[PDB]
Write a protein that binds this ligand. Structure first.
Ligand SMILES: NC(=O)C1=CN([C@@H]2O[C@H](COP(=O)(O)OP(=O)(O)OC[C@H]3O[C@@H](n4cnc5c(N)ncnc54)[C@H](OP(=O)(O)O)[C@@H]3O)[C@@H](O)[C@H]2O)C=CC1
Ligand SMILES: NC(=O)C1=CN([C@@H]2O[C@H](COP(=O)(O)OP(=O)(O)OC[C@H]3O[C@@H](n4cnc5c(N)ncnc54)[C@H](OP(=O)(O)O)[C@@H]3O)[C@@H](O)[C@H]2O)C=CC1
Ligand code: NA
Ligand code: NA
Lengths: 290, 290
């Protein structure tokens, strides 16, 4: 197991280092506040005296800092140490932040690979914990054994922004679906229906029959074509149901802003000529900036 | 097939009457604007001269009006005629509207059964189109043959508010989940990723592994207890992800209001001491009025 450097000992960075150490890697760590490395040092990690020392200690530096902006401040003194070394950026963020980092890394002559972690810190190190990677495939192939110690590395393609972008898109789907479930549970709960009683109907019947992933996936080809046949249900009729949902949430005394905004966004699609189309035409409203 | 009355000839009421007619029921219809019955009359329906005549024409009256307030205005002159007759209320609405309707119906001496339609008008009449019912089960048992002509009648319980409440809750889950999928597709599409490439990843891997209905159902018992252990991931960490999602949508030029509001609502539960708890603790924010 090759030597590795971890820069950033927040909750995520601490677990990345702990796992690399447990998997046998000689691990050098660096953090602005050195006391965060106390437990790691007891486990066999080496606390670097400086960012340059940390970068020079290993062929690979894995960074996990609060934001992309922090990277420039932290790695400033280690710019020459980064030359001909590997920098794996596991920070979450946006495509604009990744493009700037890729340009900075190219100017320094460092081999850069951007990634995104799909799990919270306690799930890192498990064989099913997905880490997305995108950019220079050669970095992943050469340092595969090290990255595989953290979980399941999945390379998405040459575009370096893919990992962070897919992280935000997939996580958005998760939060929207969980919020839908929580809002519905709070709505029936306002009338004395228990969460478990509601799960019998909602998750036992409704969600498997109406919201099966393969059913949502069948709409994908039509989303790419902008084809939204409403022969079996139109957006205008869906708007009427959204109006009832929002008024119910409000009258029942549970959260009503998200229901009102969903009604408003569907109305925008109606205003732009999608009244006859199926509900998926609201994709046209999701494509437009707010 | 027994005689039936349909009151309300909007897009849904027109199809309820058309299906009852096709299934052989002698069908009497009434609407404030009588010209809506033109096609139904050509199909063999009888246009009632008045609301009293409509109610008196059949043992069962099925109503499908825009709102519950309309019911009092429409059925006012037929109040005495409604005594000892059956009124099936298929309007969508809220629990407060249903409780008031149940009280009004009890005072009139009419047998009342509230319901909710889970499909759009073109799917009515099919054996799998679900119609929810709640309240007096004896009404459903006695008039099951007529209601079964419209689709699959599903009785939820004695509480008359259940059908409308479940309609709004389940539909909210469907819209939230579809919107999550569309927002995510628009976000990756801003970087040149096609809807089909993304759907294969998000729905082929992510949704079955993270959002399986049985996994959401396992949270239900803890939602009822208010138990949200954050040992495997905290709400504060999920809020950091929600911030990147909103910033990504904004920078990418796609819809960002829904992502910003979801971040805001999760922050409200953090402000109330749920920062260290798991994501499902945002249920406490969904229970709060806006
Ligand atoms: N936690 C999670 O669930 C997940 C996190 N991520 C991502 O991992 C990254 C790290 O997250 P996490 O560990 O949770 O905690 P944070 O996002 O809060 O990052 C904390 C780290 O940033 C350092 N830091 C902050 N400000 C500065 C500064 N001005 N100068 C130097 N160092 C600074 C901290 O140092 P110090 O200790 O000295 O304050 C610490 O090492 C983030 O990009 C996050 O989005 C990805 C997936 C899941
Ligand atoms: N359409 C759908 O996809 C679904 C609809 N529903 C529910 O079915 C019900 C009917 O819906 P829908 O058919 O789509 O259309 P609407 O909700 O717009 O209701 C139209 C009906 O209401 C009548 N009406 C409106 N205002 C008055 C008034 N002041 N006095 C008398 N009658 C009035 C109309 O009469 P007039 O023609 O004279 O204007 C017409 O018969 C609603 O509760 C809806 O939520 C349920 C599931 C799906
Ligand atoms: Na990254
Ligand atoms: Na009803």
């Amino acid at each position: 197991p090759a030597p590795v450097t971890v820069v950033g000992l927040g909750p995520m960075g601490l677990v990345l280092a702990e796992v690399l150490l447990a998997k046998g890697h000689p691990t050098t760590v660096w953090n602005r506040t050195p006391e965060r490395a106390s437990g790691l040092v007891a486990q066999g990690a080496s606390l670097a005296a400086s960012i340059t020392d940390a970068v020079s200690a290993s062929p690979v530096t894995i960074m996990c800092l609060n934001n992309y902006a922090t990277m420039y401040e932290v790695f400033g003194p280690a710019r020459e140490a980064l030359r001909d070394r590997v920098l794996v950026n596991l920070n979450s963020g946006t495509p604009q932040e990744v493009r700037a980092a890729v340009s900075w890394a190219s100017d320094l002559g460092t081999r850069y690979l951007d990634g995104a972690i799909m799990v919270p810190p306690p799930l890192v190190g498990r064989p099913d914990a997905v880490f997305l990677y995108s950019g220079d495939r050669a970095v992943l192939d050469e340092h595969r054994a090290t990255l595989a110690s953290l979980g399941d590395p999945r390379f998405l393609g040459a575009d370096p922004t893919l990992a962070v972008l897919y992280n935000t898109a997939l996580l958005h789907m998760m939060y929207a679906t969980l919020n839908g479930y929580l809002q519905a549970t709070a709505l029936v709960g306002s009338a004395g229906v228990s969460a478990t009683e509601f799960a019998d109907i909602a998750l036992g019947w409704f969600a498997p029959s109406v919201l099966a992933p393969s059913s949502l996936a069948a709409h994908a080809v039509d989303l790419d074509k902008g084809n939204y046949p409403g022969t079996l249900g139109t957006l205008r009729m869906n708007v009427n149901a959204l109006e009832h949902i929002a008024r119910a949430a409000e009258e029942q005394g549970v959260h009503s802003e998200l229901p009102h905004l969903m009604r408003e966004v569907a109305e925008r699609a109606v205003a732009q000529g999608h009244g006859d189309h199926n509900y998926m035409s609201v994709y046209e409203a999701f494509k437009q900036p707010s």
